[PDB]
Amino acid sequence: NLPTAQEVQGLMARYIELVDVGDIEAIVQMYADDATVEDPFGQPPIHGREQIAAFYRQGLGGGKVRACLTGPVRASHNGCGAMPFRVEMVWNGQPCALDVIDVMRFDEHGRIQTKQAYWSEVNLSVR
Amino acid sequence: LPTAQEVQGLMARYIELVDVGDIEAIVQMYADDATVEDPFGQPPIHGREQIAAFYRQGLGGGKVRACLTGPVRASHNGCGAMPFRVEMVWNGQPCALDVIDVMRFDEHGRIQTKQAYWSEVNLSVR
Ligand SMILES: C[C@]12CCc3c(ccc4cc(O)ccc34)[C@@H]1CCC2=O
Ligand SMILES: C[C@]12CCc3c(ccc4cc(O)ccc34)[C@@H]1CCC2=O
Numbered sequence A: 001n002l003p004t005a006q007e008v009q010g011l012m013a014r015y016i017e018l019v020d021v022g023d024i025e026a027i028v029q030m031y032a033d034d035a036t037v038e039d040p041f042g043q044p045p046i047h048g049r050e051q052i053a054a055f056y057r058q059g060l061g062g063g064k065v066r067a068c069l070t071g072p073v074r075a076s077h078n079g080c081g082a083m084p085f086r087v088e089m090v091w092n093g094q095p096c097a098l099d100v101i102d103v104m105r106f107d108e109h110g111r112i113q114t115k116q117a118y119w120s121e122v123n124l125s126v127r
Numbered sequence B: 001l002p003t004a005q006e007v008q009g010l011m012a013r014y015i016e017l018v019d020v021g022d023i024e025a026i027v028q029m030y031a032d033d034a035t036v037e038d039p040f041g042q043p044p045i046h047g048r049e050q051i052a053a054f055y056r057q058g059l060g061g062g063k064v065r066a067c068l069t070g071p072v073r074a075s076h077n078g079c080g081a082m083p084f085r086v087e088m089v090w091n092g093q094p095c096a097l098d099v100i101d102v103m104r105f106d107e108h109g110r111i112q113t114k115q116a117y118w119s120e121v122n123l124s125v126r
Helices: A005-021 A024-030 A051-058 B004-020 B021-026 B047-058
Strands: A030-036 A066-069 A081-091 A094-106 A114-119 A124-126 B030-037 B065-068 B080-088 B093-105 B112-116 B123-125
Touching: A005 A024, A005 A066, A005 A081, A005 A094, A024 A030, A024 A051, A030 A051, A081 B093, A081 B112, A094 B080, A094 B093, A114 B080, B004 B021, B004 B065, B004 B080, B004 B093, B021 B030, B021 B047, B030 B047
Parallel strands: A030 A114, B030 B112
Antiparallel strands: A066 A081, A081 A094, A094 A114, A094 A124, B065 B080, B080 B093, B093 B112, B093 B123
16 A cells, blocks of 8 residues: 555665665565666656666675664655665775665555655765 | 755755744745645645745744754755754644755755655654
C-alpha cells in the first residue's frame, strides 16, 4: 500500500542502512522499476532500475562509503518524506564528509518512485 | 538565479525571520506567484495575502521559535533544502516539531516554491 507517515520513516531509514552497508541490489529493489533519480538535484534525471543500479554501483562500489541519518525522517501523509544525513567517503585520498538531504516519493507498492538528493560542494568537508 | 552559497544565506535568513516572527519580512521573501505547500501533501497556497495569512496564523503569537538543526543543502539551480526544529505551545502542551523545508528561488532571489515536509510523527512534547 501507499506508505503511511510512519511507514515512510521506516523505509527511508532502511534506505540509509542499505547505503551504509553498500548493498546495491537491495537499494535497487527499494526503487520502483521506472523510478527517477536526481542526484545531485539540478542534474539530468536518470530513469529506471538499470540506470539507477549503474549509478549506485559507480557511487558505492569503490572504496568504503558510510552513511547515517543526522536527524529524524520528516514524513508526509501522501507517501513522501525528506531526511538529513551525512555520507563519509574518500576525497583527495583523505577522509571527507558530505551533508545531504534526500526527498523521496513512494508509490502504492511502497517502492521509491522519485528521489531528489540536495547537495553541492558547499556541503563537502574535510579534516 | 542565486548561487549555492547565496541559497544557503537566504534559507538561513528565512529561518532567522521565522524565529523572530517578522511576518512582513517573511512575506517579502516570497515571489509574486509563489506557492507554499505546508505540510507537503496539502493543497498549495497561492497569493501574497494568502501566504501572509498563513504565517500570521502560524506565528501570530510571538512565541514560536525556530532553529536550523544542520546545514542548508544547496543546489546549483537556485534550490535548497534545510532541516530545522520549531518550538511552540499547543493548547498548553509545550511542543517541538522537526521540519525540512525545500525551496526554489527565482532570478530575483525570491522564494518561488516552499515545500515543508513534516507530520504528526515529527511532533513531540517537551
Ligand atoms: C556518491 C557519494 C557517496 C554516496 C552519495 C554521494 C552523494 C549523494 C548521495 C545520495 C544518496 O541518497 C546516497 C548516497 C549518496 C556521494 C557523493 C560522492 C560520493 O562519493
Ligand atoms: C505552524 C507551526 C509553527 C511554525 C511552523 C509549523 C509547521 C511548519 C513550518 C514551516 C516553516 O517554514 C516555518 C514555520 C513552520 C508549525 C506547525 C505548527 C505550528 O505551530
